[PDB]
Amino acid sequence: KNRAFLKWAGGKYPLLDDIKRHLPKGECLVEPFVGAGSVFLNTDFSRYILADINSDLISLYNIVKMRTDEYVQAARELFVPETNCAEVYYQFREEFNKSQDPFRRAVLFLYLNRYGYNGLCRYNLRGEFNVPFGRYKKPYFPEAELYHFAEKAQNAFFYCESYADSMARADDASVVYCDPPYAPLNSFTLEQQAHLAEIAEGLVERHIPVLISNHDTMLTREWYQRAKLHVVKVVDELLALYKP
Amino acid sequence: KNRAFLKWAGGKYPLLDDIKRHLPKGECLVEPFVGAGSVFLNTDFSRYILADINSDLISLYNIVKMRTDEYVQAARELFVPETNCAEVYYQFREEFNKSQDPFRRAVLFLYLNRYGYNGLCRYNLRGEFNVPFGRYKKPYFPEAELYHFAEKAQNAFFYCESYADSMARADDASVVYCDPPYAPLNSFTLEQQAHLAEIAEGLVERHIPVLISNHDTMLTREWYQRAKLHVVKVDELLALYKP
Amino acid sequence: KNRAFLKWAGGKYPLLDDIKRHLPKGECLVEPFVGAGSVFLNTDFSRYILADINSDLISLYNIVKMRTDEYVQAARELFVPETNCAEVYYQFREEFNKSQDPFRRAVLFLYLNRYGYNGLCRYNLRGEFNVPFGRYKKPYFPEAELYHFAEKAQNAFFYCESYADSMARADDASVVYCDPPYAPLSFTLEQQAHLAEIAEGLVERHIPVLISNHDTMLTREWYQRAKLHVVKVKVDELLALYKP
Ligand SMILES: Nc1ncnc2c1ncn2[C@@H]1O[C@H](CNCC[C@H](N)C(=O)O)[C@@H](O)[C@H]1O
Ligand SMILES: Nc1ncnc2c1ncn2[C@@H]1O[C@H](CNCC[C@H](N)C(=O)O)[C@@H](O)[C@H]1O
Ligand SMILES: Nc1ncnc2c1ncn2[C@@H]1O[C@H](CNCC[C@H](N)C(=O)O)[C@@H](O)[C@H]1O
Known part of the structure; x- marks a missing residue:
């Protein structure tokens, strides 16, 4: 497994296997919250679109x-x-x-x-x-x-913009992987957490597959109520998949 | 122990024996916070008055x-x-x-x-x-x-009403058992927690017994000061207002 | 080891050998946050200024x-x-x-x-x-x-005053040991930092100061100008020595 060069919250480590199991294939991966880049670094897409607010x-x-x-x-x-x-x-x-x-x-x-x-x-x-x-x-x-x-x-373009804007770049041949700041067990708000579920629902109606990770909680099951859900033991982790 | 048909806050058994140990006796049991009903379903009172805001x-x-x-x-x-x-x-x-x-x-x-x-x-x-x-x-x-x-x-009547109205229904032949939303380690407020103790004090002086359960904390011992207290093992407290 | 006659928050029992390791020598000890008196009680200064707000x-x-x-x-x-x-x-x-x-x-x-x-x-x-x-x-x-x-x-004077007045009573011949209320794991963050600023003023004047607190992001921020020593013991505790 390839490592990120930065120490950075959830250099999403124990869950690469589980994300790669559910992550659908396509020409292009879009990451609205790239962070450390560990998904980017351990997949073989022909191109990447990587964004972050920082x-x-x-x-x-x-x-x-x-x-x-x-x-x-x-x-x-x-x-x-x-x-x-x-x-x-x-x-x-x-x-x-x-x-x-x-x-x-x-x-x-x-x-x-x-x-x-x-x-x-x-x-x-x-x-x-x-x-x-x-x-x-x-x-x-x-x-x-x-x-x-x-x-x-x-093979990547890097943008400094909000998750709404990077997700608007995904197309026909794209897949979207979202890793937002974790839900409660200038911060990221509950309005934004649900906003992110809405954008995803809209991308799957256009046949763009979206996968989101987050803690498994009452709010996360509420917002991702339309994805196929997958709980992963290791606070449990929730993977939500929106398949066309 | 007979089980409650509802899942309802705190798998409510871990207590039943200690409660029955301290809970005095009489014709009628008043529960201002019935919730799942574990106490009701595990006692043999002749009558019950059972109440909840929900x-x-x-x-x-x-x-x-x-x-x-x-x-x-x-x-x-x-x-x-x-x-x-x-x-x-x-x-x-x-x-x-x-x-x-x-x-x-x-x-x-x-x-x-x-x-x-x-x-x-x-x-x-x-x-x-x-x-x-x-x-x-x-x-x-x-x-x-x-x-x-x-x-x-x-043998029960059910009421949708705040704790103060249900406690006003107790009489000389009643006992009161209270299971408020827990004290801290549209919420139920500290003013309401204090107020419940004050109602218990006025009931016991009318010779109507009251038992209240809660966590054991600085605030709970404060509120329940004029009752006999028993600690049980986070720690639980039982406060008994005996005439 | 001599015991305090009050039960009191931070009756500093486990820390004592460490505090003495790092605490310098002089004629007078100044404690702006004496509380229960453990350091007073287990040292031998020829004189003491002991202070607290209570x-x-x-x-x-x-x-x-x-x-x-x-x-x-x-x-x-x-x-x-x-x-x-x-x-x-x-x-x-x-x-x-x-x-x-x-x-x-x-x-x-x-x-x-x-x-x-x-x-x-x-x-x-x-x-x-x-x-x-x-x-x-x-x-x-x-x-x-x-x-x-x-x-x-x-051999002691007791005053009821805030840390800034007691600290100001220290001279050439003094040493100050501060035991403030704990950093988050009331006394305000602004006061927490103010204390550290006064320490820096005493050290420039040739007056040593030792501070103790939890090890945290903030305490390291505040005491960034001191020789720092982490003591294991339930979080680690930090000791911060301002030497001339
Ligand atoms: N509103 C935002 N839009 C796009 N990216 C954002 C936004 N808010 C925070 N971020 C970035 O999102 C990434 C989130 N890291 C999540 C890692 C893990 N799930 C965690 O919460 O520790 C970070 O790189 C942040 O800088
Ligand atoms: N103000 C209230 N008056 C009457 N009943 C109330 C009031 N507030 C909450 N309740 C009910 O009181 C019951 C609380 N008992 C659960 C307490 C348990 N010790 C716990 O906090 O887990 C709940 O059913 C609430 O619906
Ligand atoms: N502003 C203050 N100035 C001087 N002393 C103060 C001030 N604020 C609080 N104190 C006292 O300083 C003492 C601090 N206790 C510290 C012990 C331990 N580190 C703890 O936080 O539990 C107490 O006795 C307080 O009364």
Whole structure:
């Protein structure tokens, strides 16, 4: 199994087998919530449409796509041992929040993801990255994963937009895989969670298959009441499939 | 222990013996929060006054009491295997939400109780029943529990009314058992929890006994201060107001 | 190890060896959040400034220091078997709340600390002490600990004031140890951070400070300028040392 180069919530890990079992075939996969990219990275579609609300994430991605070699070399230089400390971390973090250059921001963003508290991505009320120092023994530099992601990215477009807009791009030959922020056990709201079920119902009426993952709860069975449902033991996980 | 025909909050047994241990005796039992009816169905009071704010529940109970065979027969039809899919659950849920007929609604309510998600009874801001499909392999039709509930109901009256009105019906020959929505670890509010203790205090001074059960917490010991308390093992509390 | 005579939130028992490992040396110890007094009671500074916002506590501690024998003798009489019941508990609680005599308040207050639900100190919106009856088997009368506190108080001043005023009393010869109310796993987040800002001001002036708290995203954010030490023990706890 191929790994994501970023530590990122639900690098959707234990469930790849189950998603691939239910994920229907087509020319194109659309992911309105790409995140880590683990589905993207472990499937063989002829092309991908990958979107996310997080503008840093998408920008990093476009940069790993178009400037591969220059990116990897520049970023390797921050995985040295002179950087594993707080004086350097809060330093790189102040630089990231004051920079207006995409390439350098993207270099700093990968250091923060791998040297920062629990590999989190968070912002204060002014929009500044505000994850504190994560005190790790030795952060892995993800060289192999960066290369594999780049190569694989040659068949992808990356958009920074809302799930409504990326799902409007899916067509005849598309499949849609949705992995939204999890339902309760600028946040993602219950209105949006149900909105996402509606868009899916509309895409299957046009014969575009949609698959959504989420926790198994009263609200998730309510919103996905029209999909074929599949509960998966490992808080249980719910897979909802809208087949034409 | 005789079982309740409804799934209804908290698989309600884990207590019965301790309750009967402390629950004093008399002619008539008053339950302001009947819910599933476990106490009623496991005691031998000569008479019962049984009350709940939930009007779908009370209206069901009256019908099981007065139209037993007619009910059981209408309800058994909904337990055939043709009804055990998502398509039929949502159609019946919609039929119940749109119906103005107490008998048909009582029939659907048992279906929704036994085929819906975890046995819940919940409503949205529109007042509509909103529990989704439970996906159970083979739900049980509670025919024996139904008939037993009805033999016993022959000595009960059922009321749809808040705890203060039902407690006002107690007299010298009664006992009161109270099973409020639990204290914390359109909700039932802390002001209402306190108010129930105050009603118990005024009943016991009229020589009418009261037993209340709840979790054991700072607020529950506060509310129930003037009763004798027994803890049982999260921890449960029993508060007995003995004349 | 010497024990506090009150049951009190964070009667810091397991942390003590750790706090002493990292706590520097000087003439005076300043505690802005003394509470139950464990660090006071298990160190040897030649002098102490002990502070807390809770005035019943401070008044108590002043009674114990300055009226030692009159206090033990009158407190002891409440620790009998006649008094271990709800009628008596509620009678005493109401007396405490209606009383204007510091002395008798400080006597009632220990009784309530030892007979009361989980040794809690709480007040309602009226400012009346509202902890209910705790139904204990036989509550212990902390005789030795009272004498030990009093002897030890001869080298101590107690003030009832907020952390910013006590901290300001520290000089060249002082060391400050802060034990604030716990970060989320009232005292506000703004106050949590303010504390850490004052610590930074003391260290620039050559005055050491140690802080203790839960290990969390936020505590690492606030104490980002300290040598940090994680102690295992139910979340980890953080110790934050501002050294010159
Ligand atoms: N409104 C949104 N539209 C598109 N993408 C969104 C939106 N809100 C959040 N996101 C992204 O959606 C992705 C969701 N990660 C979900 C992972 C897992 N199910 C979880 O909740 O931990 C993240 O990358 C977010 O940045
Ligand atoms: N205000 C109320 N008056 C009368 N009955 C009420 C009121 N509020 C809720 N109830 C009913 O009280 C019953 C609550 N008993 C369940 C309590 C159980 N200890 C629990 O919380 O799980 C429910 O059936 C409610 O419908
Ligand atoms: N604003 C305050 N200034 C000084 N002391 C305060 C302030 N707010 C609360 N306190 C006191 O500081 C003490 C804190 N207890 C901490 C023990 C442990 N870490 C805990 O949170 O349970 C208590 O005695 C409070 O009364």
